[PDB]
Amino acid sequence: DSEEYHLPQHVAIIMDGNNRFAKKNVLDPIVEHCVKTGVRALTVFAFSSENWNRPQYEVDLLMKLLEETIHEQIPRMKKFNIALRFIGDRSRLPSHLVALMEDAEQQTAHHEAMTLTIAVSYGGMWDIANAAKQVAQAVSRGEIDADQINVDLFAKYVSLNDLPAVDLLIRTGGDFRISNFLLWQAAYAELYFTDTLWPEFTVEEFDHALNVFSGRERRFGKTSE
Amino acid sequence: EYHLPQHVAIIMDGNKNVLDPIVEHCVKTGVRALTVFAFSNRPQYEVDLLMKLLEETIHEQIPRMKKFNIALRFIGDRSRLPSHLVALMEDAEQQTAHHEAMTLTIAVSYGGMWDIANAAKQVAQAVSRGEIDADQINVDLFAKYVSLNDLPAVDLLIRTGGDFRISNFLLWQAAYAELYFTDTLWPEFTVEEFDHALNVFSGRERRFGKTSEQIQQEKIEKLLEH
């Protein structure tokens, strides 16, 4: 405990609003600011560019863009001691994209002050059902008694179970939905919604959100989680 | 045009009956489901008082449910509830089951994580019996074990009391819900503010679109109304 310290250990961001933007990288200064300030985990969802329910030509372009962006980010993540991680379904992804994700995770694992997780082909319901599948597979092997399955056991199989629970979730762009993102992990997260469009989102407003989180922790306490 | 939610959820938090005008507004506007959670590990005497209050409230509400053609439902863990409360819940559900205009669900000893892990337990028990291959488990199969799966997904979730958390309520069911937060404490929550929240919901659906499930629900309801 501490009277002065109220920094969230795990921040999640739903990046939205470029679809409404009429007229330099936004995420990079946020990521750098987080690791410099001591945030332990940052988990992000590109609300438009990870929506792969589009014509196959567009999905192909989006995957190529993701690959080029991962490649460009690896040396930057090494420079700032950030571990890159990916969550989501990999079973239907092109082999080159899977290899590139593994490569990026392997190149950035050493000497990591913060984990940056990118949601790729991810959904919160998918995550929960995947955890249930893994639990049932363990039951089939005799490793779990199905009658003893409870919240604490199930939590060990959901994505990001080795990181702190999400303390703060930010969504830009104006909508007030968490849109099937980190449903289990953000069960007790403070939710910060802003109409600022993602391309116009600033480190200053991010700091404001952190101060809002601190004030809400003072006002409503920390939760059970 | 004007967009009404199919399923409203409320976290009643506060740091005359408040819920009754809200229930009546839902019935009058065609809301199909209203699910409520009294937000707040206490001395046993306080737990007993709360249980007795819940029992008396269920008793008081049954005739209103008949009057407005509302079906009563309860979600949450029943394994540690007093047997008299469990029997009263079963009786209320059976007495109101034929009512088909709206479902009012009261969450008692409920948590969203509990709900999800309970679904996982049921699926794994079926696997243990050899009824299901664990490799078949996916979203569509799992969804049938989560509470309220026969009702529309939550479109609008209201939380009173000032905090901006969903606090482990309907995590699966509110995956695409619009979230409406108000500083108003629950005892002071009015049907006028509920009307305002519904108006805000309509504007947000116009600006940010309907969910996919909402669009399919509306297609189906148009096909059926004919």
**Dihedral pair phi/psi, residue A84, rounded to 5°:** -90, 135
Based on DSSP, count helices (H) and strands (E) in chain A, helices before strands: 6, 6
The amino acid sitting at A33 is H
Q: What angle do CA B138, B143, B147 make, to 5 degrees?
A: 155
- The angstrom resolution of this structure is 1.8
Residue that has been written with the tokens 């080159």 in this structure: A96
The phi-psi region of residue B171 (left if phi > 0; otherwise alpha if psi is between -120 and 50; otherwise beta) is: alpha
Closest CA to A154 of B142, B108, B118, B130: B118
Q: What is the DSSP string of A135-192?
A: HHHHHHTTSS-GGG--HHHHHTTSTTTTSPPP-EEEE-SS----TTSSTTTTTT-EEE
- Residue A168 pairs in a beta bridge with A11, A190
Which member of B135, B171, B179 has the closest CB to residue A177?
Answer: B179
CA distance readout (Å), B1 to B203, B204, B205: 9, 12, 10
> Is A161 an 8 Å CB contact of chain B?
no
The sheet with strand B156-159 has its strands ordered as: B70-75, B102-107, B33-38, B7-12, B156-159, B178-181
CA distance A84 to A94: 19
Write the CB contacts of A84 (distance below 8 Å, at least 6 apart in sequence).
Answer: A70, A73, A74, A77, A104, A105, A107, A108, A116, A118
**Domains of chain A, CATH where assigned:** 1-225 (3.40.1180.10)
CA distance A164 to B103: 37
Test A133 with B134 for CB contact under 8 angstroms: yes
Test B172 with A139 for CB contact under 8 angstroms: no
CA distance B214 to B72: 23
Alpha helices in B101-211 (DSSP H): 112-128, 139-143, 191-208
Q: Which residue of A has its CA nearest to B137?
A: A133
The 10 Å Cβ neighbour count of residue B113 is 22
> Is B166 an 8 Å CB contact of chain A?
yes
B221: tokens are: 């309801």
> Is B120 an 8 Å CB contact of chain A?
yes
Rounded to a whole number, what is the distance in Å from the CA of B37 to chain A's nearest CA? 15
The 10 Å Cβ neighbour count of residue B27 is 17
3-state SS assignment for residue B142: helix
> How far is it between the farthest Cα atoms of chain A?
58
Test A177 with B172 for CB contact under 8 angstroms: no
- Residue B64 pairs in a beta bridge with none
> Is A128 an 8 Å CB contact of chain B?
yes
Do residues A210 and A33 lie in contact, with contact meaning Cβ atoms separated by under 8 Å?
Answer: no
